[PDB]
Amino acid sequence: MRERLKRDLFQFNKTVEHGFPHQPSALGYSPSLRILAIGTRSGAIKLYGAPGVEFMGLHQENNAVTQIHLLPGQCQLVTLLDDNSLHLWSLKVKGGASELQEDESFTLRGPPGAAPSATQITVVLPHSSCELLYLGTESGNVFVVQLPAFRALEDRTISSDAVLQRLPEEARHREMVEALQEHPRDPNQILIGYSRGLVVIWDLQGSRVLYHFLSSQQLENIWWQRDGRLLVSCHSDGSYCQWPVSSEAQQPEPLRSLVPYGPFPCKAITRILWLTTRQGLPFTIFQGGMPRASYGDRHCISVIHDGQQTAFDFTSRVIGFTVLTEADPAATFDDPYALVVLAEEELVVIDLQTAGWPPVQLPYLASLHCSAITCSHHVSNIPLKLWERIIAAGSRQNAHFSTMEWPIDGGTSLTPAPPQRDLLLTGHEDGTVRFWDASGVCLRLLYKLSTVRVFLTEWPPLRKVGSFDPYSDDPRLGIQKIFLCKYSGYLAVAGTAGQVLVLELNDEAAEQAVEQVEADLLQDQEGYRWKGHERLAARSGPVRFEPGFQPFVLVQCQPPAVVTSLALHSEWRLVAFGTSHGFGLFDHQQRRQVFVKCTLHAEDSFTGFVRTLYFADTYLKDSSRHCPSLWAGTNGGTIYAFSLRVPPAERRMDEPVRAEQAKEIQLMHRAPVVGILVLDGHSVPLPEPLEVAHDLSKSPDMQGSHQLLVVSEEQFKVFTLPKVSAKLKLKLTALEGSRVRRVSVAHFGSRRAEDYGEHHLAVLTNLGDIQVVSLPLLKPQVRYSCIRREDVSGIASCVFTKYGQGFYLISPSEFERFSLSTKWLVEPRCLVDS
C-alpha cells in the first residue's frame, strides 16, 4: 500500500506478558508499598501491585534469583542471584509514570585466594536505617555494605571468631549463618543464629554479646517476636522451640520444645513465623516437618491458631511464602490476614480472617498451565449482555472462595479501563475450557467449563490447595478446537477422541440429558481398521449441570480420531467438524446429522486431513441467487464446496436440511489449505454469523461479483465466483521461501483518520515471522520478526485477534501479547510512591 497509509495502520510491538512466570525462584514483598516480587531462574525480576501496576527487569547475567528484599519505606529493592552478587533496583518516576531499572551491583569477595564457599551469602539483612546490608555467609562472618556505593565495611565486620571471644566461658569449639535479623524495637541489636545451634544477640556499637543460647538441634531459621522478648527457633529434626529474651544473662532453657508431627522421624522446618494478634491468639506458621517415611515428598506449609491446624499441601515445590500483616513497624499486634504462597507452578493466597481459611481469587498471575494447554481461541468485542452473564456464571462456581478484597493493592494504575471487552478461550488437556479477560493488562479468569461431566470416569491436617495438576489423566479429553458465537451464546468445542460438544449459555442450573449422535466418517470405505484410543463413554440419562455453558448434544466421530477443524454457524444452527479422515455437517437444532464426506485415497498416504472449514452465503452456481455454502480444505490442496438449503423457522423443525456437493477445486501446487475466505462486491470479507442480524450496516455487498480467497501453505489465491476462475495469486514460498502456518482476517484502524479501517490478512510464517497480506490485491505489506523459527511450540500456539493483536506462549505458563495495529497497545503504565 501507500507509505502514509502503511504507517497509519501497522506497527509491531510486543506489549506485555500475561500469566505465571516460568520456573520461579524467589519471593519478596513490601508491606509499606503492598508490592509483590517474583524472581525466576532466567534472571527476571517481576514486581506486582494493584491490577495494572506491574514492572519487570532482567539481570545482565542470566542467572537464578535466590532472594528478594525490598527496603522498608523506600521504593528500592535488593536481590541476590546464585552467583553470590547483590543488585540494587529502584523505581524512578520518568514521564509521570514509574519504571523499574537497575542501579548498582556488587559481588562479595574476600581475600585473594580464599575459598569461594566462605563468601557465599546466605542471609541478607537490610538495616532499618536503609543504609547498610548485613550479609551472613557460610563462614560465619557478617559483612556490612553501604547503599549506595557498595563498599564492604571491613571495620564493621562481625567475624565468627569475634562472637566466640565474647562468650562467657562455654565455647566448646564449634559456622554457616542460618539467621540474621534485627531487634524489632532496638535498631542497635541484631541477631545471629548459627547452624550448629549458637544464637547470639549482638550489640553493634558495643561490639559484645548481650544474649546467647546453644540449642540441642541443628538450627534452620529464627523468628523474633514483635516486642523482642520471645524467640521461636526451628531445627533440622522437625521441632520448634520457644526462648525467652530478657536481661538476666545466664542461659535460659527452651519454653516449649516439641515436634508437631512426631513421634515419627520427620524432616526439617525450613522457616517458621510467630505472629501476634489482638485477640491473644498468636499464629504459628511453619514450612515442612512432614514425616520423612510417609510424607517426605509433600510440599506443605502449616498454620496453627486457636486450636486449629492446617498443613496446606501444594502440588509443586514451595519456592517462597509470606504472611501479610496489617501492622506497621510501630504497631503492637501483627494481626495476620493473608497467606501468600509462591509455588513452583502456581500462586496460592489464603484468607486468614474468615473461618475455614478459604482461598483468594487471583486478579493476575494465573496458572494457565494447571492443565496442559492444547489450543486457544480469541473473540473480540463481546456484547455487554453476554459479558455480564459469563462473569455471573463464574461467580456461582466460585462461592467457596474468600470475600476478602485483593490485599496486594500497591501502586496506582494510570491506564484507563479497557473500552472493548475481549475474550481469550483456552483449551486444556483434562477437557476444560477457561474463559479469560483478555481486555486489559491483567488476564483474570472469568468462568471455567468442564467437559468431563458428559463422560464416565485428620492428623496430620492435610488440605490440598491450589489448581496445578501435574498428572496427565486422559489425553482423549484434550480440547482441540473452540468456537464461541458472541451473539447467540452458542459454544462449540472439539476434543481429541473425536467428540464435539455444542453448548449454550444458561443463567440458571439445569438437569438434562446430552443426546449422543454418531457421525461415521468411514461410511463409503472399509478394510482399514482403527488402532488406538476408544470412543469416550458418554453419560446416559439426565446429568445435573451448574449454571454456565450446558451441553445439549454430543457428536461422536467414527473413527474417534483427532478433530482438526471446527466451524459453527449459529444463525443456520449448523456445526461442521473434520478429522484426519473426513468431515461432516451437523444440524444441532434438530439434533440430526446432515451429511458426512470421506476424504481418503492401517496407513498408506498422508493426504486428506481436513484443515479448514468456512461457512459462506455466496454464489456457487448462478450469478443471481446466493445460497448458503460450506467450504472444506484438505492437506492435498483439495477445496470442496457444498450447497446448503437452510429452511425458514416455520419449516426449520419440519423439513430437514439438505446438502449437495457443488464444487471441487484442486490446487496447482498441492499444498495444504490453511484458510478459506470469501469477499463481497467491495472486497470485504463476509461478516460473522448473526453479525448482520445485530448490525445491518455490515450487510455484504451483493451487487458486485463475490471473490473466493484460498490460502495455502505455499500460495495465496483469489478466484471469481461463481465460475471459480483464477484472478490473483501470490507465490509466497516461491519469493520469500517461507510457508504459511495460519492466517486470520484483521481490521486495522487508522491513526491519522479516527474512523477508517481496512480488512487485511495476518499471516504467521513457519520462520516465526508475522506478515500482513493486503486485500484484495494479495500484496505483502510488512514482515516483523517475532517468534524464533526453532520455537515450534510457540508458533503453533499463536492466535490472532480481529483488530490486529495476538498472543503466543513464551512459556507453558504465560503468554506474550503483541500488537501490529496502530490503534491497540495494551501495556502497563503505573505510578508508585511513598
Side-chain angles (χ1 to χ4, degrees), residues 2-3 5-33 35-91 93 95-100 102-108 110-150 152-171 173-219 221-250 252-291 293-384 386-507 509-522 527 530 532-533 536-624 626-644 646-649 651-657 659-750 752-834:
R2 214 201 262 289
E3 264 57 69
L5 185 51
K6 226 190 318 173
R7 279 231 163 137
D8 299 339
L9 296 180
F10 313 121
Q11 197 169 16
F12 177 73
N13 283 95
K14 292 184 182 185
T15 74
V16 73
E17 309 173 352
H18 300 275
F20 194 81
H22 183 54
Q23 290 177 334
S25 305
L27 182 63
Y29 182 77
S30 177
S32 60
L33 295 177
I35 293 182
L36 195 66
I38 302 182
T40 62
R41 279 187 190 177
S42 56
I45 166 65
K46 293 194 172 185
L47 269 56
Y48 295 96
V53 183
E54 62 164 298
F55 306 93
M56 198 208 71
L58 272 172
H59 296 75
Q60 59 191 33
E61 288 289 341
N62 290 102
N63 288 325
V65 191
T66 58
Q67 288 178 359
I68 303 171
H69 302 275
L70 296 91
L71 297 189
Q74 302 181 342
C75 308
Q76 311 166 19
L77 62 93
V78 181
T79 55
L80 187 138
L81 318 180
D82 53 0
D83 56 2
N84 202 78
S85 63
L86 291 170
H87 303 266
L88 177 61
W89 296 70
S90 65
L91 282 62
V93 178
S98 305
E99 186 61 21
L100 176 65
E102 183 173 340
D103 284 352
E104 191 188 356
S105 61
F106 180 80
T107 299
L108 197 52
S117 298
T119 180
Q120 288 297 102
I121 307 177
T122 57
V123 186
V124 178
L125 175 63
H127 201 270
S128 64
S129 62
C130 304
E131 289 174 17
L132 309 172
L133 274 181
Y134 290 84
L135 306 181
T137 58
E138 295 186 359
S139 65
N141 311 331
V142 178
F143 297 93
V144 189
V145 191
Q146 190 192 326
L147 283 85
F150 283 79
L153 304 183
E154 290 176 355
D155 55 317
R156 295 167 174 258
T157 297
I158 309 177
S159 63
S160 171
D161 304 330
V163 179
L164 302 176
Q165 279 181 6
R166 272 78 163 188
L167 296 190
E169 288 306 319
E170 199 43 78
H173 282 336
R174 46 141 67 109
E175 280 281 54
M176 178 144 185
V177 184
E178 297 281 357
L180 186 61
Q181 305 175 34
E182 179 187 339
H183 192 293
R185 257 60 177 175
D186 191 7
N188 188 30
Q189 306 180 38
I190 65 171
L191 182 138
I192 306 179
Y194 300 102
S195 183
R196 60 184 181 90
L198 176 61
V199 180
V200 304
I201 296 185
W202 181 267
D203 198 315
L204 291 172
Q205 52 170 37
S207 300
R208 54 195 177 100
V209 174
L210 312 173
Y211 170 87
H212 84 92
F213 62 87
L214 179 58
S215 65
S216 60
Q217 300 292 337
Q218 187 179 45
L219 180 70
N221 206 326
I222 282 289
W223 192 262
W224 212 333
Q225 208 183 223
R226 192 157 203 88
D227 55 349
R229 268 185 160 72
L230 182 69
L231 283 177
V232 180
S233 65
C234 55
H235 303 278
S236 287
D237 63 335
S239 60
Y240 70 98
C241 307
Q242 302 180 0
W243 304 85
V245 183
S246 53
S247 158
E248 303 268 346
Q250 211 43 269
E253 313 71 14
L255 281 185
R256 226 150 308 164
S257 178
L258 59 95
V259 182
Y261 289 161
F264 287 158
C266 308
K267 208 40 182 275
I269 312 291
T270 304
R271 179 180 165 203
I272 189 170
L273 287 82
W274 182 270
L275 311 178
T276 65
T277 60
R278 57 179 180 270
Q279 293 87 7
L281 301 167
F283 276 82
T284 307
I285 300 99
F286 64 90
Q287 174 188 352
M290 294 294 132
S294 300
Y295 301 93
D297 54 324
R298 299 290 182 96
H299 318 280
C300 303
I301 295 178
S302 306
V303 176
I304 302 180
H305 172 258
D306 195 10
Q308 308 182 48
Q309 186 164 347
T310 297
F312 297 98
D313 177 66
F314 310 93
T315 51
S316 41
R317 190 212 306 175
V318 178
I319 295 300
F321 73 101
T322 182
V323 183
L324 316 186
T325 63
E326 202 199 351
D328 289 319
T332 56
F333 300 107
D334 294 301
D335 184 66
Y337 64 91
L339 174 58
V340 182
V341 177
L342 177 65
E344 203 176 14
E345 301 290 342
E346 54 180 348
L347 182 73
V348 177
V349 183
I350 302 297
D351 186 9
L352 296 178
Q353 294 182 334
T354 309
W357 295 332
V360 181
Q361 299 193 34
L362 304 182
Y364 49 82
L365 285 169
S367 283
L368 310 169
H369 72 325
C370 46
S371 177
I373 301 184
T374 62
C375 65
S376 58
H377 180 67
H378 186 278
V379 193
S380 304
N381 193 23
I382 309 301
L384 189 63
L386 185 79
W387 180 269
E388 295 173 348
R389 293 171 59 189
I390 304 299
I391 304 183
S395 299
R396 190 157 227 89
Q397 59 187 194
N398 298 330
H400 59 276
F401 272 88
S402 171
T403 184
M404 152 183 287
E405 308 216 82
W406 183 246
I408 314 181
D409 49 3
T412 294
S413 181
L414 298 181
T415 59
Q420 178 172 325
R421 296 166 294 272
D422 296 328
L423 274 178
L424 172 57
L425 312 193
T426 57
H428 300 272
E429 177 180 312
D430 61 350
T432 55
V433 177
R434 281 174 170 80
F435 284 56
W436 306 93
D437 180 13
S439 305
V441 179
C442 294
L443 191 66
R444 166 174 140 266
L445 178 61
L446 303 175
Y447 159 79
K448 187 179 69 177
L449 166 66
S450 296
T451 68
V452 79
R453 296 293 312 278
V454 300
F455 302 117
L456 292 167
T457 199
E458 33 190 304
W459 197 273
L462 289 192
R463 172 188 169 184
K464 288 183 172 58
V465 290
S467 301
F468 183 76
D469 185 12
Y471 308 143
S472 299
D473 192 351
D474 200 352
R476 307 177 179 87
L477 303 170
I479 303 297
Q480 297 298 329
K481 297 297 173 182
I482 300 178
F483 197 107
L484 170 66
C485 176
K486 62 179 182 177
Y487 298 103
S488 72
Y490 280 145
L491 176 64
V493 294
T496 311
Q499 72 278 27
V500 178
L501 289 170
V502 184
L503 305 89
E504 185 180 6
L505 183 61
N506 197 335
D507 309 77
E511 177 174 330
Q512 56 180 273
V514 183
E515 298 287 353
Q516 186 254 279
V517 177
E518 188 167 30
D520 190 8
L521 293 181
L522 273 275
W530 170 259
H533 330 295
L536 290 164
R539 279 234 194 248
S540 311
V543 178
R544 301 171 56 90
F545 291 126
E546 59 176 351
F549 284 95
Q550 303 165 346
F552 54 88
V553 55
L554 163 62
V555 183
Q556 173 66 217
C557 293
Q558 204 67 34
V562 179
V563 186
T564 72
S565 56
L566 186 67
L568 176 68
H569 201 291
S570 51
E571 177 172 335
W572 308 332
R573 291 200 172 93
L574 306 173
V575 49
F577 45 87
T579 72
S580 61
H581 313 288
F583 64 99
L585 183 58
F586 182 76
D587 183 11
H588 69 75
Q589 171 56 79
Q590 301 182 15
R591 292 98 155 97
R592 237 175 300 270
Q593 187 75 19
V594 179
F595 84 98
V596 159
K597 172 79 180 187
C598 178
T599 49
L600 272 51
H601 45 49
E603 74 270 359
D604 187 4
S605 70
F606 32 80
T607 325
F609 206 136
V610 182
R611 287 283 302 272
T612 315
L613 298 174
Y614 178 76
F615 284 100
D617 186 12
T618 180
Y619 307 97
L620 278 73
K621 296 176 181 182
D622 288 322
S623 300
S624 287
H626 51 89
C627 68
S629 62
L630 177 63
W631 302 78
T634 63
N635 257 13
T638 310
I639 295 93
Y640 299 96
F642 291 79
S643 179
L644 303 184
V646 180
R651 324 269 260 194
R652 194 53 174 95
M653 308 76 167
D654 300 352
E655 37 204 28
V657 190
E660 176 177 341
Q661 181 172 345
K663 293 283 187 174
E664 182 175 349
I665 305 101
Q666 177 65 56
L667 290 175
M668 49 235 67
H669 45 283
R670 213 159 299 267
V673 182
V674 300
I676 302 179
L677 192 73
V678 176
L679 312 177
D680 57 0
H682 295 136
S683 300
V684 180
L686 293 187
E688 289 170 288
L690 281 179
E691 186 174 352
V692 189
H694 296 66
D695 199 332
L696 201 141
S697 62
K698 272 77 179 303
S699 178
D701 182 68
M702 316 306 298
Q703 289 294 294
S705 184
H706 282 195
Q707 301 157 73
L708 168 67
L709 169 61
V710 178
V711 177
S712 63
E713 290 192 356
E714 295 184 0
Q715 299 179 16
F716 298 75
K717 286 209 65 182
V718 168
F719 306 93
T720 300
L721 299 181
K723 289 188 175 181
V724 200
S725 54
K727 185 173 64 178
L728 298 145
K729 64 156 41 193
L730 169 64
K731 310 173 92 168
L732 179 62
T733 305
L735 279 152
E736 302 182 2
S738 58
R739 307 184 67 92
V740 181
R741 276 292 178 275
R742 58 168 47 91
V743 58
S744 300
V745 194
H747 178 82
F748 294 86
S750 184
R752 165 180 293 175
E754 165 76 4
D755 189 73
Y756 179 76
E758 306 173 354
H759 288 81
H760 297 300
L761 296 179
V763 178
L764 172 76
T765 68
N766 67 328
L767 304 181
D769 300 344
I770 296 178
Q771 306 194 33
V772 176
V773 179
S774 62
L775 285 174
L777 299 185
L778 295 182
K779 281 151 56 182
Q781 306 299 293
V782 277
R783 179 168 80 257
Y784 306 117
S785 182
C786 173
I787 318 178
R788 301 169 294 183
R789 55 185 59 188
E790 303 85 12
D791 190 8
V792 293
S793 41
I795 289 180
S797 66
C798 180
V799 55
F800 294 103
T801 73
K802 201 205 298 180
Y803 296 84
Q805 288 185 125
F807 308 92
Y808 81 103
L809 287 170
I810 62 175
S811 91
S813 60
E814 66 181 350
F815 281 97
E816 182 163 32
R817 172 196 303 262
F818 62 89
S819 176
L820 52 141
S821 174
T822 57
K823 299 286 291 300
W824 291 95
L825 195 67
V826 187
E827 71 144 20
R829 191 174 187 269
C830 46
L831 175 75
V832 50
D833 42 357
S834 59

